[PDB]
Amino acid sequence: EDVTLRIAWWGGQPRHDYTTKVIELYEKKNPHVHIEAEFANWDDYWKKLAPMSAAGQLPDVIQMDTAYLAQYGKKNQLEDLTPYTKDGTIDVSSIDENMLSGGKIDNKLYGFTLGVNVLSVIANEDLLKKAGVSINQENWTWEDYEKLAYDLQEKAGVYGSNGMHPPDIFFPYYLRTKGERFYKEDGTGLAYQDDQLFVDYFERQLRLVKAKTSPTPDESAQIKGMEDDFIVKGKSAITWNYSNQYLGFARLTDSPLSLYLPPEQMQEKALTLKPSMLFSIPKSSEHKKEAAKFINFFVNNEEANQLIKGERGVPVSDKVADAIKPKLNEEETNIVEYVETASKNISKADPPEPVGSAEVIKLLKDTSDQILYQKVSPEKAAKTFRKKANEILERN
Numbered sequence: 001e002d003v004t005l006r007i008a009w010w011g012g013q014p015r016h017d018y019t020t021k022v023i024e025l026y027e028k029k030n031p032h033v034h035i036e037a038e039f040a041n042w043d044d045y046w047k048k049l050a051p052m053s054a055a056g057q058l059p060d061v062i063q064m065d066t067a068y069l070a071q072y073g074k075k076n077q078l079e080d081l082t083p084y085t086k087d088g089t090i091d092v093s094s095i096d097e098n099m100l101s102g103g104k105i106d107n108k109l110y111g112f113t114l115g116v117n118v119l120s121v122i123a124n125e126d127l128l129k130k131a132g133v134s135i136n137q138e139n140w141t142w143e144d145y146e147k148l149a150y151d152l153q154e155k156a157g158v159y160g161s162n163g164m165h166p167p168d169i170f171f172p173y174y175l176r177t178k179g180e181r182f183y184k185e186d187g188t189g190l191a192y193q194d195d196q197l198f199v200d201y202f203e204r205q206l207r208l209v210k211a212k213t214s215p216t217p218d219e220s221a222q223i224k225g226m227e228d229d230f231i232v233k234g235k236s237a238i239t240w241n242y243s244n245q246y247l248g249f250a251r252l253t254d255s256p257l258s259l260y261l262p263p264e265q266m267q268e269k270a271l272t273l274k275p276s277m278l279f280s281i282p283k284s285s286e287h288k289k290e291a292a293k294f295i296n297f298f299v300n301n302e303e304a305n306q307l308i309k310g311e312r313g314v315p316v317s318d319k320v321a322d323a324i325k326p327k328l329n330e331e332e333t334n335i336v337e338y339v340e341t342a343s344k345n346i347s348k349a350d351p352p353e354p355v356g357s358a359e360v361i362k363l364l365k366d367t368s369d370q371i372l373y374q375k376v377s378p379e380k381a382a383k384t385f386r387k388k389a390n391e392i393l394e395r396n
């Protein structure tokens, strides 16, 4: 039976163009389905969606990030996709459960993850060789990493860290290497109860900065764009970033760059499969089955992914991930291979950012600067941070 399906997403023009081709491919294969696409840049997208939420007129397939996933989900606007994953509609046989965890709110699958990124240590291989150093990514520890950064400074005259900013990403990574977490599951306070974890993390940051193998805050504040960034300029041999950012860095840099598993990820599976973005279906949709079939095509059809080519992150299906590599250049292939390697020892996505998250972020950023400026001790800072952070979170 003929049907019209409304499909919405955000991005820039390249994404619009290949997404349109994917849609045309779907209509070519399924001529009973007629698709009306709505798209905009990020700013405009959410503005355009708000009045459709209002009138119960959301498109049948809508692209989401985790933050709006949580907002729409909490307002009961989104259809649980779980049954579609059981009843044959969305095939998840080549999609590990951990890939999809980022779309799960309150045990409901409100969004289907379209691609993932994973934290990495990205290295300039030429500068590793100039220093005569090497990274054994399997099992290296925080001490090994510290020693690496000193060797980089002493023997190659460059930094071994880009600064591990922002701290709201990398201190939580640290805590996970230690079998700990930053936020409580319920969002009401800090999970970790030992301030020594904070002290240990930031005492290391100080050592690195004091040893001149990580930037001082003023240096960090001068970096405007990616063409200024430390790895791009050869100022650091090391940059800490999600896997997708490697593409940007590699196109801008002369030197061969590689992605490495960060230190001490192994024992507690500290890395997570972070969703790039998700497709959701509103409860108001009159075509929820056809919307789910489109989502399935989008994630499992290999011909379609020959067009998408990992632009929305590394494909959640290991079959699709492997199938696109022949068409990807080396740098894009490196990203896929990295994530595939990381995914062998990895944890589910974190839960949704709790309310008050933006203030905690700023608090931790200001706290880090004061520590590196030595305006406050790491000991003292651990205490005031816990107190302020818990007061913010206690409000939710």
Ligand code: NA
Pocket: 325, 326, 327, 328, 329, 330, 333
């Ligand atoms: Na390739």
